[PDB]
Amino acid sequence: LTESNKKFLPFQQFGRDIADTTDAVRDPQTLEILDITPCSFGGVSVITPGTNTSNQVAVLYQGVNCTEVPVAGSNVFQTRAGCLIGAEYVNSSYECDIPIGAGICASYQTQSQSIIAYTMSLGAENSVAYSNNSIAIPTNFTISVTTEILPVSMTKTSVDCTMYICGDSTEC
Amino acid sequence: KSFTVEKGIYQTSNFRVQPTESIVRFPNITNLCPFDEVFNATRFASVYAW
Amino acid sequence: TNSFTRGVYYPDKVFRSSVLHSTQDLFLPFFSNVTWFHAISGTNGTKRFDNPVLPFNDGVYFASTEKSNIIRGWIFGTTLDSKTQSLLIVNNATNVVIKVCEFQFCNDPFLDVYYHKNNKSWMESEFRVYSSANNCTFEYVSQPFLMDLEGKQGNFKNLREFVFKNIDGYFKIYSKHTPINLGRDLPQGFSALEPLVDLPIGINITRFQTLLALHAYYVGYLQPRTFLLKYNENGTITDAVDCALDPLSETKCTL
Amino acid sequence: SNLLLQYGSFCTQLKRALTGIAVEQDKNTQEVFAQVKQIYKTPPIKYFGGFNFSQILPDPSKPSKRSPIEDLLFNKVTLLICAQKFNGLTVLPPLLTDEMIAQYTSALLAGTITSGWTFGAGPALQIPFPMQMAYRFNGIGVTQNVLYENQKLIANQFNSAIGKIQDSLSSTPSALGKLQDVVNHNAQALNTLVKQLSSKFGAISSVLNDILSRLDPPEAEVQIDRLITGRLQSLQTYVTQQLIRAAEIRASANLAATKMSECVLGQSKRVDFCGKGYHLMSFPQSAPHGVVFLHVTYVPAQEKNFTTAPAICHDGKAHFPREGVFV
Amino acid sequence: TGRLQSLQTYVTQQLIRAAEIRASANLAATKMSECVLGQSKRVDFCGKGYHLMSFPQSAPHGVVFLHVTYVPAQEKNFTTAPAICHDGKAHFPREGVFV
Amino acid sequence: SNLLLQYGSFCTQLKRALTGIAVEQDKNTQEVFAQVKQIYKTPPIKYFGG
Numbered sequence: 001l002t003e004s005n006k007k008f009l010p011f012q013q014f015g016r017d018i019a020d021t022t023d024a025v026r027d028p029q030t031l032e033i034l035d036i037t038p039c040s041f042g043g044v045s046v047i048t049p050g051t052n053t054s055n056q057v058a059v060l061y062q063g064v065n066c067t068e069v070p071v072a073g074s075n076v077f078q079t080r081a082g083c084l085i086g087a088e089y090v091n092s093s094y095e096c097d098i099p100i101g102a103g104i105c106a107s108y109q110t111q112s113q114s115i116i117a118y119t120m121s122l123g124a125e126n127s128v129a130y131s132n133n134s135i136a137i138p139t140n141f142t143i144s145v146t147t148e149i150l151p152v153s154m155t156k157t158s159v160d161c162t163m164y165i166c167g168d169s170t171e172c
Numbered sequence: 173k174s175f176t177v178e179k180g181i182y183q184t185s186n187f188r189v190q191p192t193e194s195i196v197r198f199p200n201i202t203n204l205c206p207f208d209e210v211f212n213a214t215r216f217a218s219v220y221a222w
Numbered sequence: 223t224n225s226f227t228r229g230v231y232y233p234d235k236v237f238r239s240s241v242l243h244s245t246q247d248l249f250l251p252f253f254s255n256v257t258w259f260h261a262i263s264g265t266n267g268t269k270r271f272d273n274p275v276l277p278f279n280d281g282v283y284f285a286s287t288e289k290s291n292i293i294r295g296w297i298f299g300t301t302l303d304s305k306t307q308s309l310l311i312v313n314n315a316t317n318v319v320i321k322v323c324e325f326q327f328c329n330d331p332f333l334d335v336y337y338h339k340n341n342k343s344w345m346e347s348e349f350r351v352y353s354s355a356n357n358c359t360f361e362y363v364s365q366p367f368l369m370d371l372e373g374k375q376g377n378f379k380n381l382r383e384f385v386f387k388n389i390d391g392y393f394k395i396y397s398k399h400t401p402i403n404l405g406r407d408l409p410q411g412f413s414a415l416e417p418l419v420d421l422p423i424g425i426n427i428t429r430f431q432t433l434l435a436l437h438a439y440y441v442g443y444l445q446p447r448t449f450l451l452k453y454n455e456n457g458t459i460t461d462a463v464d465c466a467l468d469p470l471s472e473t474k475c476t477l
Numbered sequence: 478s479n480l481l482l483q484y485g486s487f488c489t490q491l492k493r494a495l496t497g498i499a500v501e502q503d504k505n506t507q508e509v510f511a512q513v514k515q516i517y518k519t520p521p522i523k524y525f526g527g528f529n530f531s532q533i534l535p536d537p538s539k540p541s542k543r544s545p546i547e548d549l550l551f552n553k554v555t556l557l558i559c560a561q562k563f564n565g566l567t568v569l570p571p572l573l574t575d576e577m578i579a580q581y582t583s584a585l586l587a588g589t590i591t592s593g594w595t596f597g598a599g600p601a602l603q604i605p606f607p608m609q610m611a612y613r614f615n616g617i618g619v620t621q622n623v624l625y626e627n628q629k630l631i632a633n634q635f636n637s638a639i640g641k642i643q644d645s646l647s648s649t650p651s652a653l654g655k656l657q658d659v660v661n662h663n664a665q666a667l668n669t670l671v672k673q674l675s676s677k678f679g680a681i682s683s684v685l686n687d688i689l690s691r692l693d694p695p696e697a698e699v700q701i702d703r704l705i706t707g708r709l710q711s712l713q714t715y716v717t718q719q720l721i722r723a724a725e726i727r728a729s730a731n732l733a734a735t736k737m738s739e740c741v742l743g744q745s746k747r748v749d750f751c752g753k754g755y756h757l758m759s760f761p762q763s764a765p766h767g768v769v770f771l772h773v774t775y776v777p778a779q780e781k782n783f784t785t786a787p788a789i790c791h792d793g794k795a796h797f798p799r800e801g802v803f804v
Numbered sequence: 805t806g807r808l809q810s811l812q813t814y815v816t817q818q819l820i821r822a823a824e825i826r827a828s829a830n831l832a833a834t835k836m837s838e839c840v841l842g843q844s845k846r847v848d849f850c851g852k853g854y855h856l857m858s859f860p861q862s863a864p865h866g867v868v869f870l871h872v873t874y875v876p877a878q879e880k881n882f883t884t885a886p887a888i889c890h891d892g893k894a895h896f897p898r899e900g901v902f903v
Numbered sequence: 904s905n906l907l908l909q910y911g912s913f914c915t916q917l918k919r920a921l922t923g924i925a926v927e928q929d930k931n932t933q934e935v936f937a938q939v940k941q942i943y944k945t946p947p948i949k950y951f952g953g
Contacts, residue, residue: 123515134604135605625894679909
């Protein structure tokens with residue numbers, strides 16, 4: 001329940017909206033208009049660097065204002081994806097290891113080992129020297145060999161509709 | 173479904189908060205009787221006149 | 223004449239803001255003829271009444287424009303006798319009276335002195351069409367609904383519109399009063415009817431008649447139709463369109 | 478919830494299939510935009526040989542570092558969103574926010590106009606812009622002397638053409654039809670899924686509380702048996718429609734990756750691939766859930782007919798042109 | 805009906821998945837007919853950089869390509885000019901850059 | 904028909920999908936064939952160099 005500013009006409013009582021959800025009600029005593037909203041929910045996920053290197057994790061709740069409502073660790077942080085607990089928001093920038101959302105990437109890096117979450121960096125910042133008259137001609141090269149993988153065909157399969165569905169029973 | 177996991181993110185379950193109490197506000201104010209006023213009158217009557 | 227846009231009401235008690243909704247309820251179809259129904263009813267000599275019996279074709283839409291109290295009331299019923307239950311509604315000047323009780327037959331207004339308007343204006347002649355019966359039911363006295371806003375120097379006409387319908391026993395009365403300037407029958411504009419009175423009285427109703435005291439009204443029949451209501455701002459019906467009048471309306475309902 | 482277990486593991490793939498679609502949309506954005514290794518930037522001065530680039534280069538006056546052309550695109554695409562979060566349906570945010578999407582686009586502009594096309598095949602090498610256009614006329618069949626002898630006229634022809642683009646979008650309401658139908662199909666599919674909850678599918682009522690309360694438990698299970706499968710097939714249809722639609726976008730995402738690879742990082746000789754006519758160069762522009770290209774093409778005009786002969790004999794021996802036609 | 809629904813689901817999933825593979829199979833057929841049987845001028849089609857040739861290699865349910873590319877390095881800046889004027893008339897390069 | 908309307912909107916989905924397929928077929932012919940603005944006409948005499 002929450003306070004409603006929308007003005008009702010005297011005869012009508014409910015406040016239904018697009019689709020079939022009830023959106024507003026009126027008080028049966030003292031006749032006051034109220035507003036409704038579902039209480040929060042969401043999915044949880046676990047960010048881990050693998051059992052090979054460590055065992056600490058940092059879970060995340062999706063779309064929950066943890067500042068507004070307590071969820072119930074190491075730290076708390078607010079992100080447009082949700083609330084992240086178990087990591088601290090370092091101010092520097094590196095490349096991305098584990099994506100979260102809205103340009104936040106986490107990794108298992110030292111400062112003595114901990115899980116940190118930072119802001120994504122698109123690469124090393126570089127500039128070029130444009131000019132009215134400036135050309136740069138290369139003098140040496142490099143013969144490289146890359147690689148590329150491509151699927152071609154899957155595995156052929158076949159089924160027997162009568163045998164699978166009916167286990168050799170003449171009634172089926 | 174393993175004892176070894178690789179790095180990355182993995183969705184496991186979902187989070188849901190729970191209700192705390194219940195609120196019932198039936199119609200206003202209320203309907204009521206005046207027979208209780210009889211109790212605060214004053215005198216009664218005869219024995220063949222209950 | 224033909225009804226233009228009147229005959230729309232709020233179907234339920236639900237507030238919806240700025241939405242387009244579809245409705246299946248009984249309605250007055252758009253662009254349908256209405257009979258004039260003029261009764262002189264001058265109450266002269268023995269009997270001059272122009273009241274026939276109306277078949278009550280799935281509810282009645284009623285419109286009128288009196289000065290103060292010319293149009294008075296209604297009887298609903300089937301046999302119109304004490305044998306069967308009959309609705310009666312009278313708008314007294316103080317408070318309305320509604321009586322479901324069985325009545326033998328309605329009485330008549332007084333066939334008084336011929337000077338009906340010369341010097342006879344004293345409020346009197348409660349001509350008591352209500353009769354006496356034993357098995358008698360509950361009454362629903364409440365505030366009057368025929369309050370008139372004063373029309374001064376002409377060009378003011380409080381048009382009265384009421385829809386009476388019966389669905390699964392329950393009897394619904396919808397009312398509205400439009401104080402608009404009008405010189406033609408059912409003037410242009412759009413007006414949505416509020417729900418006013420509900421009756422939990424389930425009886426068969428196939429006939430009805432009007433009370434005129436004295437000592438002019440339009441009647442239409444509702445049909446099942448599908449409309450597209452539009453709710454705007456604080457749950458106000460700004461417009462409603464038909465789904466079977468013309469192909470353009472069919473495309474409007476489809477999209 | 479107990480009745481759902483006897484049907485088995487149907488929704489496990491339904492959560493698994495939508496995960497694969499979700500991780501795919503964060504991959505489609507990758508190769509369309511992140512074709513470069515280092516983020517470049519333009520110098521403070523902006524005199525590109527007499528060509529006006531103010532419409533596509535970022536303007537720092539606004540908070541978001543966007544360009545005036547793509548700013549018009551943002552207002553035109555219009556997205557209710559509140560009711561979708563109220564039935565277990567979620568909308569995950571994209572991995573790349575709109576700020577760095579504009580930064581990839583700004584990086585591709587800076588490498589193109591300064592370094593030419595060589596930054597797509599190695600280290601970026603700077604070159605002045607009037608000679609870069611001399612190396613794109615050379616790849617369509619005309620000679621370098623055309624450009625410098627008409628440098629000022631071509632500059633006005635390019636500058637006036639790019640100003641017509643902004644008014645072209647505003648005048649036509651059916652311009653950005655393709656991007657608009659993407660968000661329209663997603664929202665319309667969601668509303669049809671939510672409105673399926675009001676359907677009863679041949680049961681007593683569409684509210685699970687009323688079936689449990691008004692009727693006894695022993696035949697309540699058979700009533701919710703018909704209710705679950707009606708809701709389940711509605712959920713099954715949504716994923717199958719999403720699976721087909723996701724493959725169609727991937728076909729368009731791969732085509733957009735090719736145009737950025739060929740029409741932007743080089744001059745393409747495929748006829749009517751980059752644009753309508755002989756191709757010169759291109760420009761990428763970001764958009765909500767899509768990309769917008771600005772192809773610059775070449776079109777001849779002002780014809781004049783002549784008389785020709787395929788060879789010349791001078792000293793008893795035929796002669797053939799080295800590169801040209803005898804007119 | 806529960807078991808027949810399982811085949812209806814399973815066949816639908818395989819039909820969609822087989823359409824994705826054929827899209828990859830057609831791309832592999834194009835790469836073998838352009839990156840192997842010739843030289844392709846398409847940018848970033850036969851690998852990053854300027855392309856030279858390629859070598860197919862077999863694989864279980866797939867194919868592996870070994871693109872041999874060309875990448876410049878060791879850059880050095882210079883001062884240039886669009887043309888050359890010798891005797892009152894401009895001179896334009898036929899294939900090179902006036903450096 | 905009193906039962907089909909009671910099942911929801913299982914016709915609108917299968918009527919908006921066949922319409923999308925049908926309008927797509929008329930689109931496909933446009934890019935394949937209508938690649939020219941004007942309609943050219945062949946000359947009457949037909950000696951094209953042997």
